[PDB]
Design a protein around this ligand. Structure first.
Ligand SMILES: [Ca+2]
Length: 302
């Protein structure tokens, strides 16, 4: 199932409303867990407070709306969840901790409050960014773990370490692997191994001509290699208003692909791509932090 040069999706509407007290659910990370979906997300309340949560595991996507929403007592904004197989330990990576990126570990990722004390994941800084490093994602191959991240500044960054040294810090240095205008490579990168192909997929969130969010895609044949544009304009995006099949939202924004595995290989099935994204009613206005983001799911047409 080669990636299409022109993507066509169908979509759900919003799959859950935020639990009373939160105005939004955002930045989804999602793994398979004992035949169910296990999702973590960023929260925002009705004032000025960012936080995080998970849902109870749920079997089918109709069950997301009724799955109990569990606030985390330790905020892990824009989280990445995965199982790190070589040490039989679950990892939750995030930002806005004591350094640029942080992680915690657990033996039960369903427990929102069962994560370890905060560990340093990345301690670097980047030039020409108001946010600093944001929206990490991690992926490993046979020999190395990789960290990719953005800076709301048109650049995508990469760090690596031998897989035997993980979990641990990637250090303080990173390599720019792509650069473009701020709007073209904005944030929310996600990197995956394509099942059955010697190819990796990166999707990156962009800001379109009239402010609408959408995803641009790139591929590589090795995680330390160069990235090649795969679907990189608003009119021919990886996923956006042009091809989502969604009218409940114009935005197709910070989310994650459904994976074939929970572990660090971050594998996805190109025969059945599905994107769990955040979207919002186009009639929604007000400040960015209060925007009523909700989860939705795209399914690739083939
Ligand atoms: Ca993310």
């Amino acid at each position: 199932c080669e990636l299409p040069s022109t993507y066509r999706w169908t979509s759900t509407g919003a799959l859950a409303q935020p639990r009373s007290g939160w105005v939004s659910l955002k930045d989804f990370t999602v793994v398979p867990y004992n035949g169910q979906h296990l999702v973590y997300a960023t929260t925002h309340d009705t004032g000025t407070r960012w936080g995080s949560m998970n849902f109870e595991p749920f079997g089918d996507w109709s069950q997301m709306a009724t799955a109990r929403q569990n606030a985390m007592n330790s905020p892990t904004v824009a989280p990445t969840l995965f199982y790190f197989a070589p040490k039989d330990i679950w990892v939750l990576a995030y930002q806005w901790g004591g350094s640029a990126f942080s992680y915690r570990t657990s033996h039960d990722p369903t427990d929102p409050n069962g994560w370890s004390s905060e560990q340093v994941l990345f301690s670097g800084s980047i030039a020409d960014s108001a946010t600093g490093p944001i929206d990490q994602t991690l992926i490993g191959d046979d020999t190395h773990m990789y960290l990719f991240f953005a800076g709301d500044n048109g650049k995508i960054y990469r760090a690596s370490m031998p897989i035997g040294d993980f979990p641990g810090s990637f250090g303080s240095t990173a390599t720019v692997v792509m650069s473009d205008t701020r709007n073209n490579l904005f944030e929310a990168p996600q990197v995956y191994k394509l099942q059955g192909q010697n190819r990796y997929l990166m999707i990156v969130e962009a800001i379109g001509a009239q402010g609408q969010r959408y995803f641009r895609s790139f591929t590589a044949t090795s995680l330390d290699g160069e990235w090649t544009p795969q679907a990189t304009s608003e009119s021919n995006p990886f996923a956006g208003k042009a091809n989502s099949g969604a009218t409940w939202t114009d935005d197709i924004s910070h989310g994650e692909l459904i994976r074939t595995t929970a572990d660090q290989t971050m594998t996805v099935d190109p025969c059945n791509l599905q994107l769990l994204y955040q979207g919002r009613d186009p009639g929604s206005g007000g400040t960015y932090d209060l925007l009523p983001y909700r989860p939705g799911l795209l399914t690739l047409q083939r």
